[model samples]
Target: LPEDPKWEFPRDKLTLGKPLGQVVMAEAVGIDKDKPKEAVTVAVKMLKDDATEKDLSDLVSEMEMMKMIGKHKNIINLLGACTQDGPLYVIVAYASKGNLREYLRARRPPEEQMTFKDLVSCTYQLARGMEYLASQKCIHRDLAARNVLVTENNVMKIADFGLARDINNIDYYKKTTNGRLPVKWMAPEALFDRVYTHQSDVWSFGVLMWEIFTLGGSPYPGIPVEELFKLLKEGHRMDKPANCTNELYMMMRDCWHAVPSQRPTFKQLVEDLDRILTLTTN
Candidate 1:
């Protein structure tokens, strides 16, 4: 994606800002006036102790993406950064309500557990967020629930950018690092050929839908760790999550098609979710 000529670098913000000082009173009290929901925290990505100028050069791409798309509401915006000269940190907006995974976990049955309405809202917000990213020609190499954040108002926003690619090619950005790929959420081609495209991201979104349906349950729960790769390669599919409707199940299943080109785009996902939201309110 071409850089927006209008994007301004926050040179002043970085030099003037202070470290979002650790949460000293976060646990001492509950929602203090000084530390209420409005309190802003930032997720800072730290550089390695041995980071060199070459390492700094490699990070330029990431910093560019952060600076460009950070202002989008559905994304966790980049605030500023401690330059390569100091303790390197690229700061981003923090979620007051925590990550989606924890939010789902904490809301147990005794409490107002995730109702269908709540789930649909989350799904809609997430899709809209990704839709923006897609429009900007960005590929969310990692799009699972764990990387999503929930605001105090229950809005879901994308947090991190692991590896990004453009939309023109239905292929992945082949890189030297390859250890952190999530097998269960990966599309067939992504796992096999290391080719990750928007379709592959759509495939991951399908698993994310399952995650919400199962209230953060791990995908492929019963499969042994060693056999997962083999199982997916052979075209194995998971059963519909409990209480997942046929329509919703089919939508998610479409994202897992063996052929990458078969998956729906984020635009379609938003439309489908809108229709599904009108029907079910359990």
Candidate 2:
């Protein structure tokens, strides 16, 4: 590590600290906080030993992409980075309420329960964030409840920098040694071939929407990894979740279209979501 460095950056911009899951929270001193305190829940993702060159570059890609997108309301904002001082660190805005999946799980019996409009708002925020990403030519390979974070006010922001998990890993795998994927959420192309594009992301977003409307239900109920894709090829799709309107399920169906070209672009999704919002309520 001392001799084989691949990336470098200024060390003083961030202060390193203990882990918050796989990365550290961005409570570092020396940050230019006077003007940049606009974003909250800022966290820092750091690199440790055993990180492959591929891992190093991919995290760099995510950082650059975050910076390139600029101040998007729904996408998680990257404050800065520190590539020096032993491990590389990528600073990102934090979500006080944590990731979406666990948040919904915690709120179950959902207390007052989220209305249809509330669910629409959450999904609409995601689509807009993704719209911004897609407009900038960014493909969020990982778009799921776990990859998104929620604020105390319940606003959603896309997070995780494209590094997501296996179907049920409580946490993300920082190192790539053990490989597992969220197979059910993936599109056929991403599952069959090693291809990822905005189209593939649309496929995943459909699954994410399903995760939400079902109040955090699993994506493919009563299905295993091996059989899922096979079933998909036969044109079988997820049964619309309980209480999920045909209208919402239709949007998801369009996303899961057999041909990659058939899926709706994120921009179009935004228009449809706006139309659907008026019809959904508590």
Candidate 3:
């Protein structure tokens, strides 16, 4: 099916600014045809001029996944796209507060500490988003702290669909190509068997929780991939963050269960997080 033309944004209407990070994203000011007087500021991710066939395939797939998933409170909103001609442009709602990793790193304890309640709330919000994704039959292959964008109100919105996939029927997906991998956050099955499932994402969420508790520390720090895999085989998990409560740390451990079926679903995670949030706030 052809994409909805209503989402076809005019290329001329976009006024690009400085390009941002790992993705070819540019700060942009876009004006709607109906309301040309006012300008809407957004981030436009463009396909590189030297994009390979695989790059184009991935970009198209990302668009399809985003369109299929539609809008959710905790997922980044897709404002529009410029795919009729020239380079492909995906315009999404600009995240004023940037990504969670940078946000957490910038605000360290003592100088600018985040409350325990606030930290738990972040994970709670993320679980809510992941729950939505799973319900839509989508698998966010790259579920990490850095991929989550924080808005002006400190609300976390899951973004970066480059590695996302729709698991419509087969129930799971396996990696065929060796692209850049987030091994540190990957589950044992993903690392060894190249299999990806909703359960594997739960494993990544455990790593993301560690990131939140550590205020953005890299996972499996200082441990080489060789040693990390060996240690994981021996059932060694990262020690709980110094500031993390036993309750929260245990939740992370639960996500890392050796058996994929043993891991809690995102729905269960949302409920668990809500319980924790209630306790923390009360």
Candidate 4:
């Protein structure tokens, strides 16, 4: 695939640092491609030296998908990339506060205190981002708290598009083969029938909602993969987190409807969550 000229960033201009998963924090000279200006912090995503051919293609597709989706306050925006030269480096704004999962767990008891509104805010922002992705005909096959990045101001921006699929002229995308899937976060149709759609993402969002409410506890607790499917087949769902309100838990249950068509849309999620936020303020 040909690289987009507008997204071709210069490698020489970047001062790279420690890795944050596959991404690295870097100081760049310019935000605009042409004129070099003040130093700015950005994240550079690149493959390791031993990266396979498939890995290269995956990174390329992720970059392409992100570029296609464009910018939104709740979605991590792609700044630029250096796909033309040595290594493929994707540039984007750095989230100083790191991922939401770690952030929540670290602040679980000690350190900073967290209010219920803070949890609601993260879910609301995520719904807004997911709503944007759905409009663009993209299914984020993976939507989990670990994949959500938080900024210094506590804004949640959806990240990690590795399993995202673009659906064109169809209601859902079906997969015949599989590698690794987020089983705990997957909808029943996704696990059993190998189908993915916006509703499947909603199911995942419900799990994410649980994660946020639980202050970053893992889903399914002690249940293993084999047992997980068995219980799920029997209509089992996760129990509400500690101190979770019935209304909020009800919203999460709405997302886990067995039939995909019965699940709440991202739009509905936004509205439902907005109501909760409003009530919390008073």
Candidate 2, residues 1-282: lDDT per residue as tens digits? 232232223455455565662577655443445745332335878656777777787677666666666678897777666655456677777778888898776665615577778888999989999888777766667788988888778889998664532223222323442233578888777656645668778999999999998878888888998788888999988879777889999999999998988999898898899888866542
Residue pairs with clashing backbones, model 2: 41-94, 42-94
lDDT of 1 by residue, 1-98 (tens): 23333432233333223332121111111112355334344455554557777655545556667776646778877654546334445556556787
Once fitted onto the true fold, the runs of candidate 3 whose alpha carbons sit more than 4 angstroms away are: 1-3, 21-37, 168-180
User: For this target, which candidate reaches the highest lDDT against the unseen true structure?
Assistant: 4
| Clash pairs detected, candidate 1 | none
TM-score per candidate, in order? 0.78, 0.81, 0.90, 0.95
lDDT of 3 by residue, 6-54 (tens): 7887777777776661243443444456666567878877667677888
lDDT of each: 0.69, 0.74, 0.83, 0.86
**lDDT of the structure predicted as candidate 3:** 0.83
Worst 10 residues of 3 by lDDT: 169-178
- Which should have the higher lDDT, number 2 or number 4? 4
**lDDT value, residue 238 of candidate 3:** 86
lDDT, candidate 3, at 175: 60
* Candidate 2 similarity to native, TM-score: 0.81
Worst lDDT run of 10 residues, candidate 2, spans 164-173
Most accurate candidate by TM-score: 4
Q: Tell me the deviation in Å of residue 6 in model 3.
A: 2.6
Question: lDDT of model 1 at residue 138?
Answer: 79
The number of clashing residue pairs in each candidate reads: 0, 2, 0, 0
lDDT for residue 57 in candidate 2, whole number 0-100: 72
